[PDB]
Structures are given as structure tokens and as C-alpha cells.
Design a binder for this molecule. Sequence first.
Ligand SMILES: [Zn+2]
Ligand SMILES: [Zn+2]
Length: 75
Amino acid sequence: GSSGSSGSLQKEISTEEQLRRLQEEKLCKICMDRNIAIVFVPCGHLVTCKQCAEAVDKCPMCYTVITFKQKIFMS
Ligand SMILES: [Zn+2]
Ligand SMILES: [Zn+2]
């Protein structure tokens, strides 16, 4: 003889997964390791992070020479 039957209908996502969805959608796209905190000039494309942005001499998407490393403050 035993008892105990419970079951509530609910569900939610934690910051871990959630963020992993957006955080991994805006951040760098080349290495996808760090967060995008730099743009390109003239074409402003923050599709790269401090590392990449610097590594790539010219926009890896617009092949437009980067003669300026502007830093944004999205956060
Ligand atoms: Zn990167
Ligand atoms: Zn560009």
C-alpha cells in the first residue's frame, strides 16, 4: 500500500539556454567565441569580436578595408 501522485502542468527556460539562443545569435559569427564589441569602417558591421575584428584587415563580409576600429557599447 503506497500513495503519492502529483503532476503540475508548467515549464520554463533558464537563463542558460535562453541566452544560448540570443547570446549565440548576435555575438561574433566568425569564431563564435567572444562577444561583438567592435565595428568596421566605413561599413559598420559588428559581426566580429575584438579578436576577429582586429584579425581581419578588411570586412570579412564587405571586403572593405578597415581603416578604423570603432568600439560600441551595446551592453
Ligand atoms: Zn570572434
Ligand atoms: Zn562590412
